[PDB]
Amino acid sequence: TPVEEAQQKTIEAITKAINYMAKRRIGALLTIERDTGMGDYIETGIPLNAKVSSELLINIFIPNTPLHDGAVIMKNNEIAAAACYLPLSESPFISKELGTRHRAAVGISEVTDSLTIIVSEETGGVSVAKNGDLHRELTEEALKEMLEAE
Amino acid sequence: PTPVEEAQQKTIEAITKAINYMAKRRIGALLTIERDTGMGDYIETGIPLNAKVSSELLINIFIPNTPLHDGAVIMKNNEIAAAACYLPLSESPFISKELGTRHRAAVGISEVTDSLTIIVSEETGGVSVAKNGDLHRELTEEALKEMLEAEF
Numbered sequence: 001t002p003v004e005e006a007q008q009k010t011i012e013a014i015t016k017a018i019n020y021m022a023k024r025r026i027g028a029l030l031t032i033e034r035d036t037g038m039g040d041y042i043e044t045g046i047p048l049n050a051k052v053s054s055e056l057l058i059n060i061f062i063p064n065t066p067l068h069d070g071a072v073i074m075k076n077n078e079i080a081a082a083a084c085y086l087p088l089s090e091s092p093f094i095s096k097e098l099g100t101r102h103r104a105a106v107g108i109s110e111v112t113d114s115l116t117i118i119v120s121e122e123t124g125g126v127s128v129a130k131n132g133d134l135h136r137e138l139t140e141e142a143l144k145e146m147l148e149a150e
Numbered sequence: 151p152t153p154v155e156e157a158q159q160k161t162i163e164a165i166t167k168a169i170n171y172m173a174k175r176r177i178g179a180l181l182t183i184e185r186d187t188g189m190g191d192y193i194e195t196g197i198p199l200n201a202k203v204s205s206e207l208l209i210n211i212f213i214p215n216t217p218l219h220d221g222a223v224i225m226k227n228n229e230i231a232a233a234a235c236y237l238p239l240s241e242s243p244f245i246s247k248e249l250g251t252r253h254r255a256a257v258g259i260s261e262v263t264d265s266l267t268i269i270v271s272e273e274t275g276g277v278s279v280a281k282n283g284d285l286h287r288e289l290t291e292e293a294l295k296e297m298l299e300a301e302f
């Protein structure tokens with residue numbers, strides 16, 4: 001159906017962008033709003049309300065650019081805003097080598113049902129935060145599975 | 151000012167801030183503003199964005215060696231409609247011979263539409279505008295914004 005084709009197109013765009021960024025060790029933080037509204041965090045960023053594409057996602061996160069510092073928040077199949085604030089987790093159970101990108105992802109996942117994808121700038125590793133937990137060192141297949149499950 | 155006029159002023163401010171930044175850094179850019187001649191056929195050649203304008207987004211689009219930086223950004227009123235769009239190349243003999251494809255594309259679209267196109271040269275940082283088949287080069291920041299305000 002149209003809604004199903006649109007959701008798969010968006011999953012494909014996200015996975016292509018994440019793969020590109022992982023290969024080049026480009027840090028990225030991408031939160032997908034679910035049932036818990038995240039308007040107050042969207043409002044802290046730069047408004048886009050843009051169609052999703054792998055190309056736009058890559059262009060947003062290029063290092064030392066205006067939009068790269070902070071989270072992209074997606075809502076209703078469209079990039080709502082970029083460079084958004086997310087709350088930093090104080091969880092003592094996050095891997096001690098990880099920095100603020102991963103703590104922000106975990107932090108938003110503690111107070112919402114959102115799914116956040118993180119690319120490490122140090123390793124290019126891909127992780128997902130949900131429900132207060134960080135799922136690390138994901139393969140391409142694993143990330144896809146999480147998106148389809150979500 | 152009505153809301154339409156205030157939105158226009160914010161869009162002009164976003165464009166000028168982006169162009170001034172890219173000029174200083176020698177970031178090549180090609181930015182066409184649709185006017186009364188519709189440009190759907192050219193918008194459809196690019197990557198759809200339909201995004202709210204911001205100086206930050208405009209700058210991020212044209213960063214060299216990125217997916218969106220080659221080809222034209224086409225704006226519709228207060229939105230970035232699409233990026234990496236094709237425009238036709240002008241064969242006009244009044245395009246300075248040293249200029250490359252971005253300037254020829256800008257003059258090209260200006261020959262078949264009433265659009266206003268802004269170009270930043272990656273070679274010199276100079277800013278130019280194509281309108282009605284003519285290329286106006288080496289614009290000051292003040293001249294560019296006066297051209298945009300007059301275009302409405």
Ligand SMILES: CCN(CC)c1cccc(NC(C)=O)c1
Pocket residue numbers: 016020054055058214215216217218220
């Ligand atoms: C997925 C990798 N892709 C496809 C969008 C990519 C990445 C960087 C640059 C360019 N294309 C250019 C610079 O023209 C393309």
Ligand SMILES: [Mg+2]
Pocket residue numbers: 287288
């Ligand atoms: Mg002159």
